[PDB]
Amino acid sequence: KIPGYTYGETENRAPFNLEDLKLLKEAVMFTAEDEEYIQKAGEVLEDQVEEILDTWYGFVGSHPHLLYYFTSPDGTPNEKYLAAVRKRFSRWILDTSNRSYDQAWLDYQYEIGLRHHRTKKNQTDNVESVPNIGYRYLVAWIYPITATMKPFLARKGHTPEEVEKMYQAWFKATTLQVALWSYPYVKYGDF
Amino acid sequence: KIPGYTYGETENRAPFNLEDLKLLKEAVMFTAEDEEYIQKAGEVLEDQVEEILDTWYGFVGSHPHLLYYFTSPDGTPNEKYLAAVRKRFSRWILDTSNRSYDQAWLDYQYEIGLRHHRTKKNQTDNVESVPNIGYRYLVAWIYPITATMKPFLARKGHTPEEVEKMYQAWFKATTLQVALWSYPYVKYGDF
Ligand code: HEM
Ligand code: HEM
């Protein structure tokens, strides 16, 4: 059990459906081939999820304007917030790799969007923190979340081009999701 | 002259400044090393800019829901629109490589955002087309605009490690810009 992790039990239907997903997957050049390799990436990443998260949390920790989004109103880091989110963030690596991308998947993407946005931020862990994460930074994180992953994908001794195929799947999957999470941020009708 | 290309003469000020850019550059892990390598990418790409646009326009052309954003009301591609945008799109490759990322640069990023958004779309070329490019697809394009560039960066005979450095600079620069272009799409206060 992971506190706050409500995959498959959301209680809002995403405003996007499988037809939206098909066309967005096309925009990001994700095909049947990538499903194979994202799943392959999951087998490779399963044991390293703690290292990856340390890398990501280290990036957060070293940037005051990034750590800021986890802070209590007095500017100090909320330790409980960081730790609770970490378990769901870590699980997300595996969900990205293992889940079928169906309507339950989409409904969670919407939920994750809401949690970054002022709509639901700080509700999941019942914490008091900054109200909203500026959208500029979710798009910006496509880079670190994609690029810092690559080394971990090579850690099971796979062939240069196999690593490359897992990386590309990961790059597309990260981009695809961030695009979906923009929904609560974007003016109604502009998404 | 490039019709509709108003870099340095937008006479609207960006709602983001150099301090915002510093913090966004940090989010995207863009440093002085990347300024060197983005500049080097420009030298490599200068000669290849038409074949690059052929590739991107080839992607647009094979997906009806993408070609869509360049269509006249009858659903056929507006040829005047594609051709005029192609010149500004091709110049943007070199601007990304060659310009100082200063307030003049930021002001144009804001203009480019306005041009994909319903605020200014179709005004520059005085064309009749669809009102808005769904923001979901700008984020999504981070993938093809980044990944399809990579082979072009290798055509000047550079080593794979130098190509890798130009490619990483290009990936960060693309992500960085798309993040900025979200401004007119994001609910005020949520960017
Ligand atoms: C590629 C971009 C990003 C990815 C892949 C990502 C991933 C995630 C995931 C998987 C969760 C947990 C979702 C759940 O509750 O199940 C989460 C929540 C969270 N993330 Fe992000 N995120 C991104 C952008 C950012 C940025 C830029 C920040 C700023 C530091 C950030 C800070 C946070 C915070 C504070 C939460 C907890 C939100 C809440 O109160 O529920 N994230 N993120
Ligand atoms: C990484 C994402 C993208 C990049 C780097 C990019 C780049 C550009 C550039 C440089 C221009 C010309 C700007 C100027 O006026 O000087 C432009 C305009 C345009 N682009 Fe994009 N673009 C992206 C996303 C998209 C998407 C997803 C579409 C959908 C097909 C699209 C279609 C168009 C259209 C229709 C225009 C003309 C807008 C107008 O009427 O002024 N772009 N883009």
Residue numbers in the entry:
A (entry chain A), B (entry chain B): 5 to 195
From the reporting publication:
The mutant protein solutions were equilibrated against a precipitant solution containing 10% (v/v) isopropanol, 20% (v/v) PEG 4000, 0.1 M Na-Hepes (pH 7.5), 0.02 M potassium ferricyanide, and 0.01 M KCN at 277 K. The crystals diffracted to 1.6 Å and 2.2 Å resolution for the Phe(93)E11Tyr(III)-cyanide and Phe(145)G8Trp(III)-cyanide mutants, respectively (at 100 K), using synchrotron radiation (ESRF, Grenoble, France); both crystals belong to the primitive monoclinic P21 space group. The Phe(145)G8Trp mutation results in a composite rearrangement of the heme distal site cavity, with side-chain crowding that prevents cyanide binding. As a result, tunnel 1 is open because the mutated Trp(145)G8 side chain is not sufficient to hinder tunnel 1. Remarkably, cyanide could not be trapped in the crystal structure. In both cases, the mutation does not alter the global structure, as indicated by the rms deviation values between 0.15 and 0.45 Å (calculated for 190 Cα atom pairs) for the structure of the cyanide derivative of ferric MaPgb* (MaPgb*(III)-cyanide) and the structure of ferrous oxygenated MaPgb* (MaPgb*(II)-O2).
In addition to the typical 3-on-3 helical fold found in many globins, the heme group in MaPgb* is completely buried in the protein matrix by a 20-residue N-terminal loop followed by an extra Z-helix and some inter-helical loops with a previously characterized functional role. Thus, the heme is only accessible through two orthogonal tunnels located at the B/G and B/E interfaces (named tunnel 1 and tunnel 2, respectively).
